[PDB]
Design a protein around this motif. Structure first.
Motif, short mmCIF file in Angstrom:
data_model
loop_
_atom_site.label_atom_id
_atom_site.label_comp_id
_atom_site.label_asym_id
_atom_site.label_seq_id
_atom_site.Cartn_x
_atom_site.Cartn_y
_atom_site.Cartn_z
N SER A 44 23.97 21.46 -53.40
CA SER A 44 23.07 21.05 -52.32
C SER A 44 23.41 21.76 -51.01
N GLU A 45 24.66 21.64 -50.59
CA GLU A 45 25.11 22.27 -49.35
C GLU A 45 26.64 22.34 -49.30
N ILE A 46 27.15 23.43 -48.75
CA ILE A 46 28.60 23.62 -48.63
C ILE A 46 29.05 23.44 -47.19
N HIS A 47 29.84 22.40 -46.95
CA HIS A 47 30.34 22.11 -45.62
C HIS A 47 31.80 22.51 -45.48
N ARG A 54 44.74 19.39 -42.75
CA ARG A 54 46.07 19.73 -42.26
C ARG A 54 46.87 20.50 -43.31
N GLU A 55 46.50 20.36 -44.58
CA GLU A 55 47.19 21.04 -45.67
C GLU A 55 46.31 22.09 -46.35
N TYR A 56 45.01 22.08 -46.05
CA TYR A 56 44.09 23.04 -46.66
C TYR A 56 43.02 23.50 -45.68
N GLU A 57 43.38 24.44 -44.81
CA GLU A 57 42.45 24.98 -43.83
C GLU A 57 41.21 25.57 -44.50
N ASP A 58 41.33 25.92 -45.77
CA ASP A 58 40.22 26.49 -46.52
C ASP A 58 39.58 25.44 -47.43
N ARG A 59 39.55 24.20 -46.96
CA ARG A 59 38.97 23.11 -47.73
C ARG A 59 37.48 22.96 -47.44
N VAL A 60 36.66 23.25 -48.45
CA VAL A 60 35.21 23.14 -48.31
C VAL A 60 34.68 21.94 -49.10
N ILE A 61 33.42 21.59 -48.87
CA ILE A 61 32.80 20.47 -49.56
C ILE A 61 31.40 20.82 -50.06
N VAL A 62 31.27 20.98 -51.37
CA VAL A 62 29.98 21.31 -51.97
C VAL A 62 29.28 20.05 -52.48
N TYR A 63 28.06 19.83 -52.01
CA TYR A 63 27.29 18.66 -52.42
C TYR A 63 26.59 18.92 -53.75
N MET A 64 26.46 17.87 -54.55
CA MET A 64 25.81 17.98 -55.85
C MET A 64 24.38 17.46 -55.80
N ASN A 65 23.55 17.93 -56.72
CA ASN A 65 22.15 17.52 -56.78
C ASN A 65 22.02 16.03 -57.09
N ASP A 66 23.05 15.46 -57.73
CA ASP A 66 23.03 14.05 -58.09
C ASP A 66 23.62 13.17 -56.98
N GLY A 67 23.76 13.72 -55.78
CA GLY A 67 24.32 12.96 -54.68
C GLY A 67 25.84 12.86 -54.72
N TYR A 68 26.47 13.70 -55.54
CA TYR A 68 27.92 13.70 -55.67
C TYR A 68 28.55 14.55 -54.57
N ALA A 73 32.53 34.89 -45.80
CA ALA A 73 32.73 36.00 -46.74
C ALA A 73 33.72 35.62 -47.83
N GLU A 74 34.67 34.76 -47.49
CA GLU A 74 35.68 34.30 -48.44
C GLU A 74 35.02 33.46 -49.53
N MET A 75 34.28 32.44 -49.10
CA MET A 75 33.58 31.57 -50.03
C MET A 75 32.60 32.37 -50.86
N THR A 76 31.87 33.27 -50.20
CA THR A 76 30.90 34.11 -50.89
C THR A 76 31.59 34.93 -51.98
N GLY A 77 32.80 35.40 -51.68
CA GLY A 77 33.55 36.16 -52.66
C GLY A 77 33.79 35.34 -53.90
N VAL A 136 31.87 17.12 -54.10
CA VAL A 136 33.02 17.83 -54.65
C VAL A 136 33.71 18.68 -53.58
N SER A 137 35.00 18.44 -53.39
CA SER A 137 35.78 19.18 -52.41
C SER A 137 36.61 20.27 -53.08
N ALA A 138 36.31 21.52 -52.74
CA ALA A 138 37.02 22.66 -53.31
C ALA A 138 37.56 23.57 -52.21
N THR A 139 38.57 24.37 -52.55
CA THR A 139 39.17 25.28 -51.58
C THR A 139 38.55 26.67 -51.71
N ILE A 140 38.59 27.44 -50.62
CA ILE A 140 38.03 28.78 -50.62
C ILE A 140 38.82 29.70 -51.54
#
Length: 119
Positions: free
Chosen positions: A69-72, A77-91, A51-55, A93-97
């Motif tokens: 592509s997909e959000i993992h 240890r410093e960012y419990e809200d650290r997500v990883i969004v995949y790019m269509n070009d195989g990239y 719900a956080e990410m969706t927000g 990108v790691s972003a926080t919630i």
């Protein structure tokens, strides 16, 4: 109109559950396919966290919402809200919630030198 809009899809139970803009995971409305129109939350924690990410995705630019592509969910240890969004070009990108929309909002204009002393 009525009902929320699916801004994402959670890959669970061998299906792609449609996630609403408010992070309302429709586990009952899953599909046997991944929608390239939106990101796919793969292996995500409880819906409370989703719900956080969706927000963030509900406010972020539709441009990035489409490009993905997909959000993992990968907490650090410093960012419990650290997500990883995949790019269509195989990239990758790691972003926080907390600043997911902002992190992706900068696209195309992300990936700095703050990812060299952490790998």
């Amino acid at each position: 109109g009525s009902e929320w809009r699916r801004i994402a899809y959670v890959y669970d139970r061998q299906t792609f559950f449609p996630l609403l803009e408010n992070g309302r995971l429709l586990k009952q409305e899953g599909t046997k396919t991944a929608p390239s129109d939106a990101p796919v939350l793969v292996g995500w924690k409880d819906g409370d966290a989703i719900a956080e990410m969706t927000g963030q995705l509900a406010e972020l630019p539709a441009a990035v919402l489409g490009a993905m592509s997909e959000i993992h969910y990968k907490p650090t240890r410093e960012y419990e809200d650290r997500v990883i969004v995949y790019m269509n070009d195989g990239y990758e990108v790691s972003a926080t919630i907390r600043q997911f929309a902002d992190k992706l909002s900068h696209y195309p204009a992300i990936a700095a030198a703050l990812d060299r002393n952490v790998k």
